[PDB]
Amino acid sequence: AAKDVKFGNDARVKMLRGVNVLADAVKVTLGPKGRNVVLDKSFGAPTITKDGVSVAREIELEDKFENMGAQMVKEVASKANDAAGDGTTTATVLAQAIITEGLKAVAAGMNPMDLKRGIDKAVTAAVEELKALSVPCSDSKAIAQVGTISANSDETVGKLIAEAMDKVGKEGVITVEDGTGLQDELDVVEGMQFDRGYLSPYFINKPETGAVELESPFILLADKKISNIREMLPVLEAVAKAGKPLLIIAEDVEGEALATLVVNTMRGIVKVAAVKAPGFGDRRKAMLQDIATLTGGTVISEEIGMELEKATLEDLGQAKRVVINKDTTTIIDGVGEEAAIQGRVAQIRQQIEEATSDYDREKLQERVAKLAGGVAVIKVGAATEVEMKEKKARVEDALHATRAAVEEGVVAGGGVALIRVASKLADLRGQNEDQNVGIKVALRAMEAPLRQIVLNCGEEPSVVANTVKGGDGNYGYNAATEEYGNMIDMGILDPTKVTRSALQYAASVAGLMITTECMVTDLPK
Amino acid sequence: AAKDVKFGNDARVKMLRGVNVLADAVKVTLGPKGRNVVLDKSFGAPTITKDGVSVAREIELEDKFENMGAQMVKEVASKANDAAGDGTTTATVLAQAIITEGLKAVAAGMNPMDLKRGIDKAVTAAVEELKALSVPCSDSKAIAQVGTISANSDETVGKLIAEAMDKVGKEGVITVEDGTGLQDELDVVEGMQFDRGYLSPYFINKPETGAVELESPFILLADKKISNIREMLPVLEAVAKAGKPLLIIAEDVEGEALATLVVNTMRGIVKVAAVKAPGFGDRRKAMLQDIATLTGGTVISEEIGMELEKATLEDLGQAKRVVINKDTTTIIDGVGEEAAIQGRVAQIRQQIEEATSDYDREKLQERVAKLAGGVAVIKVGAATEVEMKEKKARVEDALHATRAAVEEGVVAGGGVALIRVASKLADLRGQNEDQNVGIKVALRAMEAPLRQIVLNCGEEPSVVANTVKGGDGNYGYNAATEEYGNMIDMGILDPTKVTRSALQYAASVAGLMITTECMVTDLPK
Amino acid sequence: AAKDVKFGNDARVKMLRGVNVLADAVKVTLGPKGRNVVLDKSFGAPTITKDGVSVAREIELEDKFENMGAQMVKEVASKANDAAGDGTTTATVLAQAIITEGLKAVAAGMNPMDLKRGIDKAVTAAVEELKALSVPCSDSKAIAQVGTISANSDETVGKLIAEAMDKVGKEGVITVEDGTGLQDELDVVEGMQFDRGYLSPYFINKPETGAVELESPFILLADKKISNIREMLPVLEAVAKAGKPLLIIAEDVEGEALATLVVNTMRGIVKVAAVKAPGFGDRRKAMLQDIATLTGGTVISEEIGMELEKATLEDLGQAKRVVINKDTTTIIDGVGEEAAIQGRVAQIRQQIEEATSDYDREKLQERVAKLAGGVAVIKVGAATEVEMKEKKARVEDALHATRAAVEEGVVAGGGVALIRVASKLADLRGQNEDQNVGIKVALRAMEAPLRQIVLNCGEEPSVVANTVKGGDGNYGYNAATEEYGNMIDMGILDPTKVTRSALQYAASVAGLMITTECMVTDLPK
Amino acid sequence: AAKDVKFGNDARVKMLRGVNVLADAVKVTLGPKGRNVVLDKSFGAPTITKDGVSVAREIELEDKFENMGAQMVKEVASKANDAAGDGTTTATVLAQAIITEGLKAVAAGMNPMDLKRGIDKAVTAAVEELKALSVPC
Ligand SMILES: Nc1ncnc2c1ncn2[C@@H]1O[C@H](COP(=O)(O)OP(=O)(O)O)[C@@H](O)[C@H]1O
Ligand SMILES: Nc1ncnc2c1ncn2[C@@H]1O[C@H](COP(=O)(O)OP(=O)(O)O)[C@@H](O)[C@H]1O
Ligand SMILES: Nc1ncnc2c1ncn2[C@@H]1O[C@H](COP(=O)(O)OP(=O)(O)O)[C@@H](O)[C@H]1O
Ligand code: BEF
Ligand SMILES: [K+]
Ligand SMILES: [K+]
Ligand SMILES: [K+]
Ligand SMILES: [K+]
Ligand SMILES: [Mg+2]
Ligand SMILES: [Mg+2]
Ligand SMILES: [Mg+2]
Ligand SMILES: [Mg+2]
């Protein structure tokens, strides 16, 4: 199809307009006191929200080049959120600040390479200072405090998270489910987790979380590529009985069988979830065999000459609950008999004793840790049902926050860590008058989060920013109570990973947009 | 799809225009002497109404942003009506007054946060004063007078309501049905009510009330999630015989089964009503078993290994009449034999004697109260049929009014309670010159109901408002007779819940619109 | 359909506009530091790329004559890339330079014949000088260095390529496959390669490479033209069992059977790849028989009176892996037993001893070398999977580079060889004042690659070009480190075939455009 | 009459565009290998000239902000012709170069008055050096 092509400043102005529209819509919700955005709906009353993810989801522009700019910033913010677990609006704010200043500089006649170099060196220095500023969070008390803070001053949630990480290790697997009464019950079962997501996004039955959930499902353990429906039709017919879902774990499922399964799921004949087998090479079969032993199943591989046609319900495995994420699959409470679990664990342990390679033994300890660690289950108790659901959501968010906090520590919240590092780095210089303009652009953009937070609350950003810069350590401004104080003592924290990820991804997208020479899109016809 | 995005005053002006159109259309019907609105119809002659609910239902705007404003106000007015049982037009009037003044203030340069704070504190003070004014209505005589007033001076309606509440308790279940002759007959049967509405809005066969009604229906007591039609085809086939409706009470019905049932109901092959089982956790099965023993049925649960395929008409329960609301299900006159119900009551009573927790014994007290209280039935007698239907509607509205009156008491009607509180609070002050503008906005908007009532009747609002403010207590203006006097003695009352709900929801929507920074809607294409 | 016809300068201006748009979009990505081009996508976030092939693929123009110019340059650039393995962007840059200057000269009144003659003689002289500069690369050490350089300083890739070419000869067959662990394993099996591509482009299941890949496929060895499906239904029905793909190698497949096979592949019933038999005449049957012996099959020829209807799985051959390219078919690890292979080799060797013609014996040595050489397999080992895939792609590109390097040697990269030859040929003269304008146009366009590389890096092209011209030998500019030095020592090489092919194809397309008198296209309706 | 008001960078880019139009017309005639400019005259035949002030006195633009820029830069050539009788193309070239680099420095956040003071100091020192560098003729 015929294309529209733009070069140079003509492309830059369109990207700048799109970025400004997106960020202007999204940034008014930053902080604890964000303003309201009314999002229209096809039918009924609109949606009034203070969340930036929701606002960014429904932002689409009629002009194609401005739409390119908006989508470019949006997908980088999504990447930052995925990597860190939080920080979409902050990353968007940083990206807009850097992009606006840098594109103004480029339009004046400066060398884009020098600006990009200055921005990159400023960001690297800031990241080093951020590492210097961070304080470790590894002991139980700090973990509980971080959980309570992330649960909006809910001490029970932090208590449960601390108990779970003390039970199954801080690097283990934790899952939350619905409870029965008002009691928060925690228990340990046998399971494992491997990083393979669903093959198609059309299998998702929980759009609230964007994940696939199965209750007491059968699993097909095929060590081959699925190529024809005729191979799986008897298995599908057997699964249709008793009304139980089926989980497909095989080497790969290509177009025709994937389309058949997607159509079946949409019309609801049989609910099927498909996931690729973990790993590759000769270790993939070991991973699959460990899964089969955990779930008490049988591996169907062409090497043994086994056919999916002659497969009954016996060969399938059974698990209590299975959760499939975008890029992660969790198996919880397999029915595989436990003495067989001990026998397999002992066998691979003896293999470990025979390991002669560093990488090989590392993979073997990975396998034994996955197989013998188990998973932790936290059951949410409440009086009514809606509060139980929102409490479960709070527990999930607190788990995501606590994982990053344990990974890299915590820094003062409210946007004051970036102010600390920017005030530290005020002496940084570049080799060129254009690399100096880039260094000033990146350091000026670290005050944007706190300034926008104070602006949303309704005070004067300049006075509060000056007062915070004048202080030292964790001195900062509490937006909820409109008073100053030590941010740690007021319980306003951010994990270091969130801040670092947001800053780095904003700088990345800004550098990509600064050195862009052409944009090609379809005609507006 | 591409979106249109507006910021700031550009959004505020559009919301203001939409709110003005909606409220100007709806407020001319307020009071006993409202004017006429001519609503067009697809075919034939128009509809002429003095009711604001009907007028608000058919208001749409061609401009998208103004339509967002109108729908925003309409949805909050509907919330107020649902919470209090009455007060849609009053809530719309209060909301328009506050929104207009506050948006004018915001456009002039005042700070939205301070305005919202002033409005909120004025409303809280008004609510406290309204609680101060209210007088109790708990004894039988006051209940009878409130019922008579709510039934347009119909003493028989109040007599029946007072008898029913003295019979089955002021917090019991009361239902009204069609009678046989001219006699108003009241009787007590065995029944239960639980707060679970219909699964889909397409099951409603009575658009006049917006409720589902079933006569002698069978009930399916399934303690499992229903997902495949093949589980229920035999049961549906059995139900199709004898031409009796079926009510589904289960854990949940997912996409395809719900769609199949909706299609079957729409084409009328079998009339089916679907409703979710009450509660959750381990108590949900207790409630389901109590329902089963009430209606003489059998619980079909996968734990016992029972299948819906091998289910005949025997396992189903039978009830004389079942009514389903938007969020409430009522079962009247179950065929369950009384000795089984009494033995169940004794069993849970012995459980209560063994209760060791306050909230646990609270659930148990709720259960025994629901199971042993029963329901009251009021049968409407009249000479003709149209008169009987109109009297039944009057009885229903009187029941809704009397419930709120018992819950929170009564205050003088005609809009004079709000004048009383506004005149009381004339000394209230704020911390800022912008919080003072907010306080004056909220207190000035409390005279809007009485002024609009007097304007609709045809007098001068200012003279009557001044005369009423001059008085004290229950002194007020009768719009029907154009005469002053004591409101209580002339029988013009409002429940305190209606006034409080209208004021609070109006202030809520006004605060939402004041602090709105962006509006995103689809392109007009 | 009605056409639009343009003559002379009206056609030239449109072609010039199209060529300018294409080259302006594509050339900003040239070198190690090319800028970014944002390519819109139908859904989601755009594509940001620094690769000229991707940018050139998605360029279409709304104007039809300008689109002729763009497609004309694009197709010749693709030819150059196919012939040399690299040099699409460089060929585009050279073509644009020559075309622009030559068309400017033509529009002024100079004779197109003389301009074309001058350009042709300048290019021939440059090719001779480029042959003079080239340094041979045939010994193992130079091969290893060339492989390492082409693999981005990856010594293991070069080591593997050198080992493979030392095993199976520098003119042998090399194939890369996915490995198992982290070990790079190299082995030799029995196979052959013949230059026959897929019959239809719809059989390709690997759009990343644009090739057909089959795993353990059956092959149909038919020595006749296939035209009726009824001949080939039973064989496909047999093939559908066990879910194995089928490779069709016959004299030719006409419209009906090819369409049926394409439809079957598209809907995924049976995966079929079709290829024409190699050669022609009486040698074609000998080649087909050699393939059949290699794969342990049976030739189905009408001369023996064999029918495809009475063909079972026995007559088909089996191979471990088969790869089909655009114009090349590779058979790897046939199941043909080795003693039969040796007997066949001895038989054709005895035939060679009886050869009495030079060309005939040349065909016989071709046959024996292809039959007895075998193929080399290189297996890529890595830790993760994405790394393994990227490394395999790097190995493939290094193989393409090393083949050309062995074929013709290497010259200094960065565009300094063309500067060397242009500075050598500054004394060249033509017979006419119009042939002198053509000679200056061709020599001025040889500095365009280095100037564009330096422009993309951010320096001043004139100063760097002058410094490079002042030097001698392999002195040149390193764009990655912005430092001068000897190009060989910094490891910036470029095969002579790539440069020669790019220059020649650019001159060809320029000469075609210069002597073009008319352009016929469809109406814009 | 009614007026049009432009603030900041918009004004500066319009002004620089006008400066560039006039300077690009004038600068093609500089040196031993400069060329001629044909000037249309309402009364008579066109004049073919290689003089800087003759070309500069002729330029007027359609846009009014760009016309302001051109009208301001024209005074350099006018004054140079009035004072020395020669050297007007060189003056125009220098003025355009200074304006371009100064606007680049201003867009980087510098104070224009301090830049102006620095330019003045540099030019004063330069004139002293030029006086020191001459020889009698
Ligand atoms: N009470 C508070 N006072 C000041 N800043 C706060 C407070 N609570 C949270 N914050 C800060 O506000 C930010 C949260 O903004 P949010 O809307 O969550 O955007 P994001 O999704 O990008 O994190 C965090 O950086 C946090 O440090
Ligand atoms: N005879 C009367 N004189 C004065 N006011 C009255 C009289 N009867 C009812 N009202 C008042 O009119 C209001 C009823 O208006 P209505 O049209 O029902 O609006 P809504 O549905 O919002 O209550 C009540 O607040 C009531 O106090
Ligand atoms: N480090 C370097 N310094 C200078 N020139 C380089 C360097 N690396 C590669 N080149 C040159 O850049 C060219 C590669 O450009 P490329 O984007 O690959 O275009 P093409 O696809 O036409 O080869 C080669 O001619 C090579 O000689
Ligand atoms: F143009 Be100047 F007068 F030499
Ligand atoms: K928020
Ligand atoms: K009315
Ligand atoms: K490149
Ligand atoms: K001159
Ligand atoms: Mg957040
Ligand atoms: Mg009413
Ligand atoms: Mg290349
Ligand atoms: Mg002169």
Distance CA A94, CA A89 (A): 9
Q: What is the DSSP string of B82-139?
A: HHHSS-HHHHHHHHHHHHHHHHHHHHHT--HHHHHHHHHHHHHHHHHHHHHH-B---S
Backbone angles phi, psi at A297, to 5 degrees: -110, -165
CB contacts of A439 in chain D (<8 Å) are: none
Judge whether B388 and B178 are in contact, CB under 8 Å. Answer: yes
Backbone angles phi, psi at C337, to 5 degrees: -70, 145
Q: Which residue of D has its CA nearest to A438?
A: D108
How many helices and strands, by DSSP H and E, does chain A display? 18, 21
For A191-371, CATH number out of 3.90.700.10, 3.50.7.10, 3.40.50.450, 3.30.70.260 equals 3.50.7.10
Distance CA B273, CA C79 (A): 70
**Burial readout B296-309 (b: 16 or more C-beta within 10 A, e: otherwise):** bbbbbbeeeebebe
| DSSP strand pairing (A36-39 vs A47-49) | antiparallel
Q: What is the distance in A from the centroid of ligand 12 to the CA of D123? A: 22
How many helices and strands, by DSSP H and E, does chain B display? 18, 21
CB atoms within 10 A of CB D11: 14
User: Does residue C87 line the site of ligand 3, with CB under 6 A?
Assistant: yes
Closest partner residue to C58 (CB to CB) among A3, A72, A75 is: A3
How determined? cryo-EM
Q: What is the distance in A from the centroid of ligand 6 to the CA of B146? A: 19
Provide the annotated binding site of D: 29-32, 50, 86-90
Rounded to the nearest 5 degrees, what angle is found at the Cα of B290, between the Cα atoms of B288 and B293?
Answer: 110
Backbone angles phi, psi at A309, to 5 degrees: -65, -45
In this complex, which chains have at least 3 CB pairs below 8 Å with chain A? B, C, D
In this complex, which chains have at least 3 CB pairs below 8 Å with chain C? A
Distance CA A437, CA B370 (A): 75
Distance CA A80, CA A86 (A): 8
Sign of the alpha-carbon torsion through D29, D35, D41, D44: positive
Give the orientation angle of helix D88-107 with respect to helix D9-27, to 10 degrees.
150
- C-alpha B203: how far from chain center: 19
Stated length of chain D: 137
Classify residue B419 by burial, with Cβ atoms within 10 Å: 0-12, 13-18, 19+. Answer: buried
Distance CA A510, CA A3 (A): 25
**Burial readout B192-213 (b: 16 or more C-beta within 10 A, e: otherwise):** bbbebebbeeebbeeeeeebbb
CB atoms within 10 A of CB A70: 25
- C-alpha B55: how far from chain center: 18
Distance CA B255, CA A413 (A): 44
Distance CA C345, CA B24 (A): 100
Which residue out of D49, D51, D58, D93 has the highest number of ligand 4 atoms within 8 Å of its CB and is therefore the one to mutate? D51
Classify residue C268 by burial, with Cβ atoms within 10 Å: 0-12, 13-18, 19+. Answer: middle
User: Does residue A482 line the site of ligand 1, with CB under 6 A?
Assistant: no
Mapped onto helix, strand or coil, the DSSP state of residue C169 is coil
User: Does residue C92 line the site of ligand 3, with CB under 6 A?
Assistant: no
Q: A135-190+372-409 is classed in which CATH architecture?
A: 2-Layer Sandwich (3.30)
Residues 6+ apart with CB under 8 A from C104: none
- From first CA to last CA, the distance across chain D in angstroms is 56
Distance CA B296, CA C210 (A): 70
The upper half-sphere exposure of residue D80, i.e. CA atoms within 13 Å in the direction of its Cβ, equals: 21
Smallest CA-to-CA distance from B249 within B269, B278, B229 is with B278
CB atoms within 10 A of CB C295: 25
Distance CA B453, CA B473 (A): 20
**Burial readout C486-495 (b: 16 or more C-beta within 10 A, e: otherwise):** ebbebebbbb
Distance CA B332, CA D13 (A): 82
Per DSSP, what are the bridge partners of residue C324?
C212, C329
The Cα-based distances of C65 to C15, C133, C383 in angstroms read 6, 40, 52
> Whose CA is closest to atom 10 on ligand 3?
C414
CB atoms within 10 A of CB C362: 11
Distance CA C218, CA C247 (A): 6
- Tell me which amino acid residue B466 is: N
Q: Tell me the two tokens of residue A9.
A: 């400043």
Tokens 């309704």 correspond to A458
Atom from ligand 2 closest to the CA of residue B53: 21
Distance CA A272, CA A274 (A): 7
Tokens 């209940």 correspond to B143
How many A×B Cβ pairs under 8 Å? 90
The upper half-sphere exposure of residue B525, i.e. CA atoms within 13 Å in the direction of its Cβ, equals: 6
CB contacts of A458 in chain B (<8 Å) are: 111-114
Which residue out of C37, C57, C88, C89 has the highest number of ligand 3 atoms within 8 Å of its CB and is therefore the one to mutate? C89
The upper half-sphere exposure of residue B428, i.e. CA atoms within 13 Å in the direction of its Cβ, equals: 26
Q: Are the beta carbons of A35 and B227 separated by less than 8 Å? A: no
Neighbours of ion ligand 7 (CB under 5 A): C 29, 34, 50
Residues 6+ apart with CB under 8 A from C222: C248, C249, C250, C251, C299, C300, C301, C308
Q: Are the beta carbons of A105 and D108 separated by less than 8 Å? A: yes
**What is the H or E stretch that residue C494 is in?**
strand C493-495
Distance CA A304, CA A296 (A): 18
Task: Suggest the residue from B519, B522, B523, B525 to mutate for an interface test with chain A (most A CBs closer than 10 A).
Answer: B519
Each as own residue / partner, the long-range contacts of residues B153-159 (CB below 8 Å, 24 or more positions apart, any chain) are B153/B491, B154/B391, B154/B394, B154/B398, B156/B184, B157/B391, B157/B394, B157/B395, B157/B398, B158/B398
Smallest CA-to-CA distance from B228 within B247, B204, B255, B201 is with B255
- Tell me which amino acid residue D21 is: V
Task: Map out the domains of chain B as residue ranges.
Answer: 1-134+410-524, 135-190+372-409, 191-371
Judge whether A300 and A315 are in contact, CB under 8 Å. Answer: yes
Looking at chain C, the residues that come just before a C–N gap of over 2.5 A are none
Judge whether D36 and D50 are in contact, CB under 8 Å. Answer: yes
Backbone angles phi, psi at C213, to 5 degrees: -125, 130
Distance CA A22, CA A37 (A): 13
The ligand that comes nearest to the alpha carbon of residue A400 is: 9
Tokens 């400043």 correspond to A9
Distance CA B164, CA B166 (A): 5
Distance CA B424, CA B250 (A): 53
Distance CA C454, CA C450 (A): 6
Using the 8-state DSSP alphabet, how is residue A277 labeled? P
Q: What is the DSSP string of C321-357?
A: EEEE-SS-EEEEEE---HHHHHHHHHHHHHHHHT---
Distance CA A425, CA A324 (A): 44
Q: What is the DSSP string of A139-158?
A: SHHHHHHHHHHHTTS-HHHH
HEC sequence for chain D: CCCCCCCCHHHHHHHHHHHHHHHHHHHCCCCCCCCCEEECCCCCCCEEECCHHHHHCCCCCCCHHHHHHHHHHHHHHHHHHHHHCCCHHHHHHHHHHHHHHHHHHHHCCCCHHHHHHHHHHHHHHHHHHHHHHCCCC
Mapped onto helix, strand or coil, the DSSP state of residue C70 is helix
Backbone angles phi, psi at A412, to 5 degrees: -65, 140
The ligand that comes nearest to the alpha carbon of residue A87 is: 1
Smallest CA-to-CA distance from D94 within D48, D38, D39, D30 is with D30
Q: Are the beta carbons of B517 and A58 separated by less than 8 Å? A: no
Judge whether A281 and A223 are in contact, CB under 8 Å. Answer: no
Distance CA C217, CA C331 (A): 10
Q: Tell me the two tokens of residue C103.
A: 């068309």
- Tell me which amino acid residue A272 is: V
- From first CA to last CA, the distance across chain C in angstroms is 10
Superfamily grouping for domain C1-134+410-524? GroEL-like equatorial domain (1.10.560.10)
Mapped onto helix, strand or coil, the DSSP state of residue A80 is helix
Classify residue A288 by burial, with Cβ atoms within 10 Å: 0-12, 13-18, 19+. Answer: buried
- C-alpha B285: how far from chain center: 29
Residues 6+ apart with CB under 8 A from B142: B136, B410
- Tell me which amino acid residue B353 is: E
Judge whether B116 and B124 are in contact, CB under 8 Å. Answer: no
Q: What is the DSSP string of A278-295?
A: SS-HHHHHHHHHHHHHHH
Backbone angles phi, psi at C155, to 5 degrees: -70, -30
Neighbours of ion ligand 10 (CB under 5 A): B 86
User: Does residue C90 line the site of ligand 3, with CB under 6 A?
Assistant: yes
Q: Which residue of D has its CA nearest to A436?
A: D108
Looking at chain D, the residues that come just before a C–N gap of over 2.5 A are none
Q: Are the beta carbons of D108 and A109 separated by less than 8 Å? A: no
Distance CA C477, CA C416 (A): 8
Distance CA A377, CA C216 (A): 46
The Cα-based distances of B412 to B162, B446, B480 in angstroms read 21, 14, 15
Sign of the alpha-carbon torsion through C489, C492, C495, C496: negative
Q: What is the DSSP string of A415-459?
A: THHHHHHHHHTTT---SSHHHHHHHHHHHHTTSHHHHHHHHHHTS
Q: Tell me the two tokens of residue A172.
A: 């283990």
Q: Tell me the two tokens of residue B389.
A: 């239907």
Using the 8-state DSSP alphabet, how is residue A195 labeled? -
HEC sequence for B213-260: EEECCEEEEEECEECCHHHCHHHHHHHHHHHCCEEEEECEECHHHHHH
- Tell me which amino acid residue A495 is: P
Smallest CA-to-CA distance from A23 within A49, A50, A59, A54 is with A59
Q: Tell me the two tokens of residue B82.
A: 């649902």
Distance CA A86, CA A497 (A): 9
CB contacts of C40 in chain A (<8 Å) are: 64, 68, 519-522
Tokens 């198992």 correspond to C180
Q: Tell me the two tokens of residue A412.
A: 């003062």
Per DSSP, what are the bridge partners of residue D38?
D48
